[PDB]
Amino acid sequence: WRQRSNTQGSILINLLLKQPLIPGSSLSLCHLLSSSSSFSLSALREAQNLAFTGLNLVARNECSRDGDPAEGGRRAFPLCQLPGAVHFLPLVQFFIGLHCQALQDLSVCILEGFSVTALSILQHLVCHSGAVVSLLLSGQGQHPLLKMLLHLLAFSSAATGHLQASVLTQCLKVLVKLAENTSCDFLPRFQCVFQVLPKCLSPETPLPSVLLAVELLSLLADHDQLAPQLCSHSEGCLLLLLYMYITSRPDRVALETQWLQLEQEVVWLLAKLGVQSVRALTVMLHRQWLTVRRAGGPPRTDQQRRTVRCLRDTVLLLHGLSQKDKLFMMHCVEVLHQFDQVMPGVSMLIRGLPDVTDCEEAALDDLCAAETDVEDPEVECG
Amino acid sequence: SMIPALRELGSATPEEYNTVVQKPRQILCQFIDRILTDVNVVAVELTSVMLLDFIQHIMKSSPLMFVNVSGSHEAKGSCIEFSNWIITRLLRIAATPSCHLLHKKICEVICSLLFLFKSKSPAIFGVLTKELLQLFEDLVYLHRRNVMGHAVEWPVVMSRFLSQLDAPLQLMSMQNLEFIEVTLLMVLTRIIAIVFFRRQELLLWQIGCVLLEYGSPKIKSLAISFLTELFQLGGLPAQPASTFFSSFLELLKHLVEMDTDQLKLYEEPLSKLIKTLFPFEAEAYRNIEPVYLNMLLEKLCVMFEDGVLMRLKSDLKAALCHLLQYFLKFVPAGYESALQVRKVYVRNICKALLDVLGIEVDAEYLLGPLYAALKMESMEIIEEIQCQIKHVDMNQKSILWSALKQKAESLQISLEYSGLKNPVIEMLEGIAVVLQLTALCTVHCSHQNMSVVITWMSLDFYTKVLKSCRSLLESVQKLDLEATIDKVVKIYDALIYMQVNSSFEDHILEDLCGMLSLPWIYSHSDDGCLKLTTFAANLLTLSCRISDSYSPQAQSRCVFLLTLFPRRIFLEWRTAVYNWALQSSHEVIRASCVSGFFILLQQQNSCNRVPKILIDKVKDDSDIVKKEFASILGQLVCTLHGMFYLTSSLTEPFSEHGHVDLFCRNLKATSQHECSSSQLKASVCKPFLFLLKKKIPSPVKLAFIDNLHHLCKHLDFREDETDVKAVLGTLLNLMEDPDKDVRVAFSGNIKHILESLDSEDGFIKELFVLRMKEAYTHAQISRNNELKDTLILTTGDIGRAAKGDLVPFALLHLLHCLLSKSASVSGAAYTEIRALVAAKSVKLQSFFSQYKKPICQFLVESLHSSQMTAVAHQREMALNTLSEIA
Incomplete structure (x- = not known):
């Protein structure tokens, strides 16, 4: 452990200098410098030179060496200080300022592709420096790029289109990255950015933005003050929209694998909500249990293995809610048939898994809704 | 021991229940102290194991003892502190090496403890997990002080989970440190399912990662297994992926310079991590950044430059070859690096693969790599000859194929010069490799397998190999005689694969027939x-x-190959070899000979009915032969319709069961599928329907399940009313077959049987009516709900696959269940009807309109039965039925 992964632990200049991270548009960075296109070449070339200098710095940057004892704090995986990307930040700041000015007015579209490439750039930046993200969050309008990306989130919350649809995804990526890269103390100052998430929780947002939003919700609920504030909303404590997205299933082109990623993230978020202290759980369990029960054995494909683990932690969450709150049972009566058929099925299926938990298994022994009936009249049947 | 307190636990009010439960907690803590007074009590011998078991047992019996369910935040903190005292005792046990060797129950106690503290209240779970994660962070920071050259501070108290019950985590050696890491990794693997929180998991990533970057080989393996569990759920976050892939590269590099047992102790977790991070499923490359996998690609390149296949000890080499496959076929070329860079990479790769091909004992984990490489070469050649008819040669176009030819001819000429001066097992192994790759390419790479006329290795080389293996059969002194003739029959199967793609000259074909018949002649x-x-x-x-000396498995192989020969050559001789191998005791030869005869019969004559000998084989059980026989009869129903013609399918080895033999067995046989050939009045199913019967063991019925669609698509249901009625009655006996998985299999099967049925007549409809009726009577007789569930799923299947007249039947056959009070039948069969009216492309209500008469008559009869078995009660039960039908 001598190279310290300076190359990987850097900006990933190999990544920063790589074919478009986003799908298409064929960009790379100074291609944008070749692209003479906060509205002038004035300060455009200044930001360009600052970014080139920061790139040379990160190339020559060895902030962490032989094991990184310098990176300290409650934040796990403190990447490194890396003052280089700081000088790269003005370029994306200028490009996203131009983008926000092109968004506030009813312009050009290429700036929006440049914008989403800049968002991917940001994702790369905050991916590999704790000092960088700390200044991103710290600096009211502090760090105007932060306020203007919040404004981009608001602009994309309505009148989606396709470019802003990608802006949703990449901005959620960078926020959840910035969020996950920040310590618990920074969540109180992350609350200002968190105020914008309810618009991304509108029933319009596409699935990738939705799952990234759930990841952000989990990262925020890891905080002890951000979780009650986020649950202080009106509709369903900000979670009614999430639950109805489970049941609603707005997108049909969205693969059920991505839906399962969404589901596992949701159930893990809610489990964390439990550790920091029904209709949707039942319908997703209905779909997943149908899929697994149609198969007669252990899931040989990875997607169905994740589906099985989703059954596991979903019945975990179910028994958690039932033991926490006894209103669970008449919150179940409207879906009692689905529940009484999935619970025995999923419980037998997890019994089919050789590994045991005895906690989720205690949950199985606790709920164990069986036989869904008393008997049917055989006379005049069929 | 305080049983009265352990019983009055529930009766006590929580505020003093906490005291009266601390008392037995303190008594159990005294039980621990009488053991935990000295850390080296007597010995570990692996006494205290019974103490740990009694702790677990008291815990199972009294879950509410260890933690109250009412929460009681202050008493919650008290029981947290007491669990922390227990945790400190078990952790100071786990610190001492000998006492750590007792980990089996050392997990069980705290593992179950966290399980139960989660089940009772999730907040306690989160608190305790954060405490344990803080401990793990301290541990990996100590290891970071070790690896970074700081002051190590060997003697450390490391007071974690400290308590004031009225607890030293002593460390004096790297062994104590790594052993507490062992315990931590085990409990973390056990608890990973619920601690996944999309942020806490990142901390887990980081800590397991820094543990992997520096740790003992056993610690490395346990961390490698933890990382597999992590990647299996959250994919891979970009942040720890840097350190993770760096640790991965350094581990790969070290693998060469690793001791045998040092490799062994982490072999299987390493391979699991390969398969998990590099699954077979396509798009798996999109999860990881292409520069990551590009440095992985150059890493594997330099590894093959080291000749890892020779330099390593364990072939389970198979994992790195599977990784090579992941790179080549699942991951596109030009994504990680450029296509020229990746090209020179795979060039160095296949060159090293040739060097190791020259000398190997087994080829299974190597032949697949070469197949994939030559496959991509074939595809690019086809693309560059996109439309040009053109005769092309890969010995010229592919430098890799030319080098393969060089290896083949070199090993063969070394054989010819002296078979004794060479590793007869491994030289012939490599000869087999190149030959069956050729034959695999003959049947796959060629354009006729997906305008382009490919020329593979010439046939003169093949007859040279024939004379060579003849000389081997001569010049062996018969040392083993087993592995060598197994290799020779591998060469034989290669040749016959080449022939099944393109038949040979009849005289060289006869030479091959004699080569295969030489054993047990x-x-x-x-x-x-x-x-x-x-x-x-x-x-x-x-x-x-x-x-x-000839092995029975090799007998299986050669008899199969002899059957695969055309009928024009020694037909009666194939018949005779089969009849000699027909009823022999060995299972493998029986299976192979019957799987050859299900084509050999139509080769001979009488391609309309099952041979009487195959009927005897139906009677003779040899159940494993009976399941492979169910499969080969699912094939027989077509090759008894087609003129014993096999199809050269793709059958790429996407799943290698170790030693893969009989490529033609993996190759499929087809029918001509003409209108006259496809129809069949059963005439053969009576033994088949006997095999269907429940007394027949379940796995062969499952093989029949698998073959069901094929055997019905090759079966005619137009005439033979009562005979086809009995065939269908057996198809439904398959529903009454006891195994439930077989029942749902038949549901999914009748889903296709309905369309395989040419036209839904009336008599078969009434047969279904009565048979499912008696099935429901038997199910309610047993009172077992699993029967009702299997049956209702079958009803939903047949409804989704129903014609105009069958859907009301299946619709009402589930509606009565739903009518009484049944709940599963709703969320299963009703959703099936919804999917069906989606297949009907109509609204569920408009669909109700076309069947509102049977539905209303059945709600009529439900209310009749209700009013006759019994007012407010009538009203409420009728409203229950109405809301269900609602």
């Missing part, structure tokens, strides 16, 4: 055509050498 030397055939008069001696 001295067991069947005296029949009619024994002296009529011309190969025997020359094989006699080498076959005398192989009389009894």
Whole structure:
């Protein structure tokens, strides 16, 4: 452990200098410098030179060496200080300022592709420096790029289109990255950015933005003050929209694998909500249990293995809610048939898994809704 | 021991229940102290194991003892502190090496403890997990001080989970440190399912990662297994992926310079991590950044430059070859690096693969790599000859194929010069590799397999190899005689694969027939055509050498290959070899000979009915032969319709069951599928329907399940009313077959049986009516709900696959269940009806309109039965039925 992964632990200049991270548009960075296109070449070339200098710095940057004892704090995986990307930040700041000015007015579209490439750039930046993200969050309008990306989130919350649809995804990526890269103390100052998430929780947002939003919700609920504030909303404590997205299933082109990623993230978020202290759980369990029960054995494909683990932690969450709150049972009566058929099925299926938990298994022994009936009249049947 | 307190636990009010439960907690803590007074009590011998078991047992019996369910935040903190005292005792046990060797129950106690503290209240779970994660962070920071050259501070108290019950985590050696890491990794693997929180998991990533970057080989393996569990759920976050892939590269580099057992102790977790991070499923490359996998690609490149296949000890080499496959076929070329860079990479790769091909004992984990590489070469050649008819040669176009030819001819000429001066097992191994790759390419790479006329290795080389293996059958002194003739029959199967793609000349074909019949010809030397055939008069001696030493599996192989020959050559001889191998005791030869005869019969004659000998095989159980027989009869129903014609399918080895033999067995046989051939009045199903019966063991019924769609698509249901009625009655006996998985299999099968049925007549409809009726009577007789569930899923299947007249039947056959009070039938069969009216492309209500008369009549009869078995009660039960039908 001598190279310290300076190359990987850097900006990933190999990544920063790589074919478009986003799908298409064929960009790379100074291609944008070749692209003479906060509205002038004035300060455009200044930001360009600052970014080139920061790139040379990160190339020559060895902030962490032989094991990184310098990176300290409650934040796990403190990447490194890396003052280089700081000088790269003005370029994306200028490009996203131009983008926000092109968004506030009813312009050009290429700036929006440049914008989403800049968002991917940001994702790369905050991916590999704790000092960088700390200044991103710290600096009211502090760090105007932060306020203007919040404004981009608001602009994309309505009148989606396709470019802003990608802006949703990449901005959620960078926020959840910035969020996950920040310590618990920074969540109180992350609350200002968190105020914008309810618009991304509108029933319009596409699935990738939705799952990234759930990841952000989990990262925020890891905080002890951000979780009650986020649950202080009106509709369903900000979670009614999430639950109805489970049941609603707005997108049909969205693969059920991505839906399962969404589901596992949701159930893990809610489990964390439990550790920091029904209709949707039942319908997703209905779909997943149908899929697994149609198969007669252990899931040989990875997607169905994740589906099985989703059954596991979903019945975990179910028994958690039932033991926490006894209103669970008449919150179940409207879906009692689905529940009484999935619970025995999923419980037998997890019994089919050789590994045991005895906690989720205690949950199985606790709920164990069986036989869904008393008997049917055989006379005049069929 | 305080049983009265352990019983009055529940009766006590929580505020003093906490005290009266601390008392037995303190008594159990005294029980621990009488053991935990000295850390080296007597010995570990692996006493205290019974103490840990009694702790677990008291815990199972009294879950509410260890933690109250009412929460009681202050008493919650108290029980947290007490669990922390127990945790400190068990952790200071886990710190001492000998006492750590007792980990089996050392997990069980705290593992179950966290399980139960989660089940009772999730907040306690989160608190305790954060405490344990803080401990793990301290541990990996100590290891970071070790690896970074800081002051190590060997003696450390490390007071974690400290308590004031009225607890030293002593460390004096790297062994104590790594052993507490062992315990931590085990409990983390056990608890990973619920601690996944999309942020806490990142901390887990980081800590397991820094543990992997520096740790003992056993610690490395346990961390490698933890990382597999992590990647299996959250994919891979970009942040720890840097350190993770760096640790991965350094581990790969070290693998060469690793001791045997040091490799062994982490072999299987390493391979699991390969398969998990590099699954077979496509798009798996999109999860990880292409620069990551590009440095992985150059890493594997330099590894093959090291000749890891020779330099390593364990072939389970198979994992790195599977990784090579992941790179080549699942991941596109030009994504990680450029296509020229990736090209020179795979060039160095396949060159090293050739060097190791020259000398290997087994080829399974190597032949697949070469197949994938030559496959991509074939595809790019086809693309560059996109439309040009053009005759092309890959010995010229592919430098890799030319080098393959060089390896083949070099090993073969070394054989010819001296078979004794060479590793006869491994030289012939490599010869087999190149030959069956050729034949695999003959049947796959060629454009006729997906305008372009490819020329593969010439046939003169093949007859040179024939003379070579003949000389081997001569010049062996018969050392093992087993592995060598197994290799020779591998070469034989390669040749016959080349022939199944393109038949040979009839005389060289006869030479091959004799090569395969040479074994145990001295067991069947005296029949009619024994002296009529011309190969025997020359094989006699080498076959005398192989009389009894010949392995039965190799007998299976050679008899199968002999069957795969065309009927024009020694047809009666194939019949005779089968009849000799027909009823022999060994399972493998029986399976192979019957799987050859299900084509050999139509080769001979009478391609309309099952042979009487195959009927005897139906009768004779040999159940494993009966499941492979169910499969081969699912094939027989077509090759008894087609003119014994096989299809050269793709059958790429996407799943290798170790030693893969009989590529033609993996190759499929087809029918001509003409209108006259496809129809069949059963005439063969009576033994087949006997095999269907429940008394027949379940796995063969499952093989029949698998073959069901094929055997019905090759079966006609137009005429033979009562005979086809009995065939269908057996199809539904399959529903009454006891195993439930077989029942749902038949549901998914009747889903296709309905369309395989040419036209839904009336008599079959009434047969279904009565048979499902008696099935429901039997199910309610048993009172077992699993029967009702399997049946209702079958009803939903047949409804989704129903014609106009069957859907109301299946619709009402589930509606009565739903009518009484049944709940599963709703969320299953009703959703099936919804999917069906989606297949009907109509609204569920408009669909109700077309069937509102049967539905309303059945709600009529439900209310009749209700009003006759019994007012407010009538009103409420009728409203229940109405809301269900609602």
